[PDB]
């Protein structure tokens, strides 16, 4: 019901948010599959050939059986030392994206919450217009029928208040498609809410926008990750640049070998070579292989290496000139907010001064129905704007700790202390 | 002209959907090409080397001349299986994204379709609306020769007549632009088409939302896609705990192989094994290997796949909600626009008889040129939003098929029941 | 400051464009390595080997050491030529995907600074608004106290410049929010531009429909990539229909390799065979391979890659009818934004007009203040109408150099000859 209550429920549930959890998971085991070619690797082989010779070897058949433990083992490897680094530093990268995506959620959420408070506050007072005008229409419908104001006004007065009724379908639908949007978000439909509490609020200035730029170079998510993204293709540099160098490996094998001969060209001037031996064997080798070269492969892919580290650090300065426009209009847009509550606030009271001006005109001759059905809108609409500010200028809090790579749970209680009564999201 | 004609002319030719074709094409025949490995394969090797032995050597040379058919079988290998398997799960979840963008041009086609039909509305109305004003221009320049209105009151109308002129103009590039938008999901320019039978338009209450729903878990084809993708990543489990398994094949071959011996140290003290060999060989061999340890490769390739299927079970519990949320928004939506087509026909009522109120008034001096052109405007705002109205029920009815599944040829042809008469894309 | 020097400081800085430069220059590069495998390929082996024999050859021990230069050389490899066109077409479609880029920054350059431009008019107007509206209250005040107005005139007047004021912080908020928009793609922050000059303004009419139709499907960027891909998908059939071919290679070594004998079984009834040898050898062979049968692997790859071919073949349909869209859209747009200012510019004129005849009727009693700031309103919208529809025009005249391909900094020199004073981004 309030919104810590929402995210809670939220924070448990969400698809989007577990896949990343999964992805980044995924992306930590895979450490593991990256260190194992540098662990001993031991496989068992074991045939059964049977050989037919011909044609200046016709006569002489075999059929052999052999069985062996292999043994591999890196000694020198730079390029498997590299795969697990490179992996390594994926891992991390993975890990910021999952923060990120934590991030998400929060932001998300609260946007999601305040979105179906303010379509709650479009809908009621979309209906305070409603009843105002209905008493408008009914009190000229009772001066008609006495003979004090004419047929006119009447008709004007309806015309007016079925627009008002036209809508109030719309503000309900957006209110229940908000709903809906929450319901996606959070997995629960909220029969209420916490209201934002109107006579507590207050705002207060912003940060200075270099302080807050400052922050941002520090703490912010997406550049963390654009710096960690360049970290990997310098890295990826040095993978290339190890196909120049040599490798040092290990082999280890025990195999059995059996072979009989048979036929016709078997014994008889072959002597003791087509007999029956079963051999055995126990071997340690090492194997050592320096390139030289291989058609400029090498060094052509340590070039694109070098090009695609160029590419990672424009990104750099792309999600640095993303993250100033970022800070830059959040910090804009909280002091319009602001702003605008204060214009909003003078202007309900100057709206309901000027419709009080035109009832009192109306019923000397200066001012018409018409004036009055008007001057009951701009003060409904007046109304509706002060309250939209204030929504706007609480998003605004939220997109800019989410800028500066802080937004967090804190954040929200801070949020949650502002709200109290309930609320229906489903009146009538 | 008409929708059915528009969405048959659409289907043989949009390339959206005939590279999806492709799509599903392409992953249907790379079945094939997964079952190859578990069949015959046959090669023809053949060699010439040429040696020179040096060094305790010295004086030995060859040149052999060898030429083979090899065959490899599998007879047993679990991985060869599963690769088969997962392109078949791999070209069933390309068949139902085919059913799916099937469905899109159905939805896009009739959604381009009326949305032409609703620009042509918003400037039919506009140009009605010029006119009504215009008539209005024209009579105040008529009364205000022969000394019955003020210069006020025709000054007050061309100002506002200019307004409408521009207004015009941009209802015009609307639908020169939808138009367009037609012409690119449907390869034609149409010059006309048929427009909605507004003399027979009723609406109808939606099936209750939790049978629309109970229906959509059964058969959206986004989340039948979902789901297949979460089998997909229950064999990819089964895929890489293979890799323990043992593999048994077969080889076979018949090869031949010259070799003469040439220089000074082949004769004398020699014996026999530096003659001229004439091989001749036909082998059918057994080939056996099982794992046994690869650094815990498998294992953590395993526990990758494990998470990755977390994720998928993930992604399925993202289809629902996102599509909980297309059909109660829909639901909700298809009853927000009946109440709105009830809503601006009354409106479109009061807004006549208001207007009629306003001409009153002016001729005895309770109401301005300027109420009665505002009036003017009302009563054209509200046939507007009605004739707007009536499309987004249309549009909604779509939207609530595509979600359930079944948007298909026979729900495209009650629509065209709902069309007569034809209509202009350029008028003037 | 203009516009020509906006753009020139975005070309040397801009991260998104150096990025695809970088994408460019590393596919060009990789020709490098996709000739590679058609030259010498030149390897150095060198191990040492220990075996231990048992049972049946127990008491027979060697350790051997061998040491070789080895050569890998093409002669005949269609598939090794292929990879070579296949990246040399490869880097051909990057270096179109630069020339769309190189294109994008000139057109999201002006676009931006133009943007600039509105919201500085929009503001200035909005200012403008705001004191006609303030010079109406104060006279009205006045006139309150000498007795000549009634108190419902300066209650009328202040609710109205309330909202006016509302409006301010909206107009100033998206002007410091475009300047962001600017500085994004630019890099600098801009205190000031050169203003579009509205003395010196005139329109043209575009070239025909068709002319324009016909150059660009000679020169746009977008399809010329379309059909380099589809290219790109034939030589890929071919790519396929390769593996049916037979390979013709090329080996060379030389090589030395010790092998001392030990232990029990060494002498004696051996006879030469376990002594020492120190072997030397120089090899030069040719390989030769041809498939006959895969298991269909072959030939379902090829039918794969034809299906593929449709697929691209399609995607270049697509791209034909979403260039023809961006044409003839764009054509729509420029006309309809030349109607525009002719119906704007007649609008100021009936407006200004109008608001003298309420100002007029106000004063004689047939008008209200209400009316006289209604005037005032609807004067001021059309003038930031007009001024909105001159730079709606100039980005249309963007929007379709781009989309005929020609788009550059000669057609950004004519915009910049449209300049003319300077302007402030943030003005009081």
Same mark, same amino acid.
């Given at each position: 019901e309030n919104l810590m209550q929402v995210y809670q429920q939220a924070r448990l549930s969400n698809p989007e948010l577990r896949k990343s959890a999964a992805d980044r998971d995924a992306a930590f085991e895979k450490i593991n599959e990256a260190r194992s070619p540098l662990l001993p690797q031991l496989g068992l082989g074991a045939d059964y050939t049977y050989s037919n010779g011909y044609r200046d070897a016709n006569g002489i058949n075999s059929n052999a059986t052999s069985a062996s433990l292999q043994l591999t083992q890196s000694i020198f490897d730079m390029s498997k030392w590299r795969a697990l680094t490179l992996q390594e530093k994926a891992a991390g990268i993975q890990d910021v994206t999952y923060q990120t995506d934590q991030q998400t959620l929060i932001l998300n959420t609260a946007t999601a919450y305040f979105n179906v408070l303010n379509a709650i506050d479009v809908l009621s007072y979309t209906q305070a217009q409603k009843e105002a005008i209905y008493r408008q229409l009914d009190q000229t419908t009772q001066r008609f029928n006495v003979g004090l104001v004419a047929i006119t006004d009447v008709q004007n007065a309806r015309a007016q208040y079925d627009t008002v009724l036209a809508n109030e379908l719309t503000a309900r639908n957006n209110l229940d498609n908000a709903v809906?949007?929450?319901?996606?978000?959070? /997995?629960?439909? *909220?029969?209420?809410?916490?209201?934002?509490?109107? %006579?507590?609020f207050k705002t207060d200035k912003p940060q200075p926008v270099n302080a807050l730029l400052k922050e941002a170079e520090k703490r912010n998510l997406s550049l963390l990750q654009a710096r960690l993204?360049? #970290?990997?293709?310098? %890295?990826? @540099?040095?993978?290339?640049? #190890? /196909?120049?160098?040599? +490798?040092?490996?290990?082999?280890?094998?025990? /195999? @059995?070998? #059996?072979?009989s001969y048979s036929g016709s060209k078997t014994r008889g001037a072959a002597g003791t070579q087509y007999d029956d031996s079963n051999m055995g064997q126990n071997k340690v080798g090492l194997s050592f292989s320096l390139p030289i070269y291989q058609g400029g492969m090498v060094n052509s892919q340590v070039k694109q290496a070098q090009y695609n580290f160029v590419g990672?650090?424009?990104?750099? %300065?792309?999600?640095?000139?993303?993250?100033?426009? +970022?800070?830059?209009?959040?910090?804009?847009?909280?002091?319009?907010? @602001?702003?605008?509550?204060?214009?909003?606030?003078?202007?309900?009271?100057?709206?309901?001064?000027?419709?009080d001006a035109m009832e009192a005109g109306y019923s000397v001759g200066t001012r018409t129905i018409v004036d009055v059905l008007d001057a009951t809108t701009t003060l409904y609409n007046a109304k509706q704007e002060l309250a939209n500010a204030?929504?706007? *200028?609480?998003?605004?809090?939220?997109?800019?700790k989410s800028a500066l790579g802080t937004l967090n749970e804190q954040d929200l209680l801070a949020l949650n202390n502002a709200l109290s009564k309930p609320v229906s999201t489903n009146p009538e």
């Amino acid at each position: 019901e309030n919104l810590m209550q929402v995210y809670q429920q939220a924070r448990l549930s969400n698809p989007e948010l577990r896949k990343s959890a999964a992805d980044r998971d995924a992306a930590f085991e895979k450490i593991n599959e990256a260190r194992s070619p540098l662990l001993p690797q031991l496989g068992l082989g074991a045939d059964y050939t049977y050989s037919n010779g011909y044609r200046d070897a016709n006569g002489i058949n075999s059929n052999a059986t052999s069985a062996s433990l292999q043994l591999t083992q890196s000694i020198f490897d730079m390029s498997k030392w590299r795969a697990l680094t490179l992996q390594e530093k994926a891992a991390g990268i993975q890990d910021v994206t999952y923060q990120t995506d934590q991030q998400t959620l929060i932001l998300n959420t609260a946007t999601a919450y305040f979105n179906v408070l303010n379509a709650i506050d479009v809908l009621s007072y979309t209906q305070a217009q409603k009843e105002a005008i209905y008493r408008q229409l009914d009190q000229t419908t009772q001066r008609f029928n006495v003979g004090l104001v004419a047929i006119t006004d009447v008709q004007n007065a309806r015309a007016q208040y079925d627009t008002v009724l036209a809508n109030e379908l719309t503000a309900r639908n957006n209110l229940d498609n908000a709903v809906e949007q929450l319901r996606q978000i959070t /997995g629960n439909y *909220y029969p209420e809410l916490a209201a934002l509490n109107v %006579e507590n609020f207050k705002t207060d200035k912003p940060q200075p926008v270099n302080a807050l730029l400052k922050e941002a170079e520090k703490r912010n998510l997406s550049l963390l990750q654009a710096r960690l993204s360049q #970290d990997l293709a310098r %890295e990826q @540099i040095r993978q290339a640049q #190890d /196909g120049h160098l040599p +490798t040092l490996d290990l082999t280890a094998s025990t /195999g @059995i070998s #059996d072979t009989s001969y048979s036929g016709s060209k078997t014994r008889g001037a072959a002597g003791t070579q087509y007999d029956d031996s079963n051999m055995g064997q126990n071997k340690v080798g090492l194997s050592f292989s320096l390139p030289i070269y291989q058609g400029g492969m090498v060094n052509s892919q340590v070039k694109q290496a070098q090009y695609n580290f160029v590419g990672a650090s424009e990104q750099l %300065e792309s999600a640095h000139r993303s993250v100033v426009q +970022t800070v830059r209009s959040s910090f804009n847009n909280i002091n319009a907010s @602001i702003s605008s509550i204060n214009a909003y606030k003078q202007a309900v009271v100057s709206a309901q001064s000027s419709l009080d001006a035109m009832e009192a005109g109306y019923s000397v001759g200066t001012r018409t129905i018409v004036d009055v059905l008007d001057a009951t809108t701009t003060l409904y609409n007046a109304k509706q704007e002060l309250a939209n500010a204030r929504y706007n *200028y609480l998003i605004n809090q939220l997109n800019i700790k989410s800028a500066l790579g802080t937004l967090n749970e804190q954040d929200l209680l801070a949020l949650n202390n502002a709200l109290s009564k309930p609320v229906s999201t489903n009146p009538e």
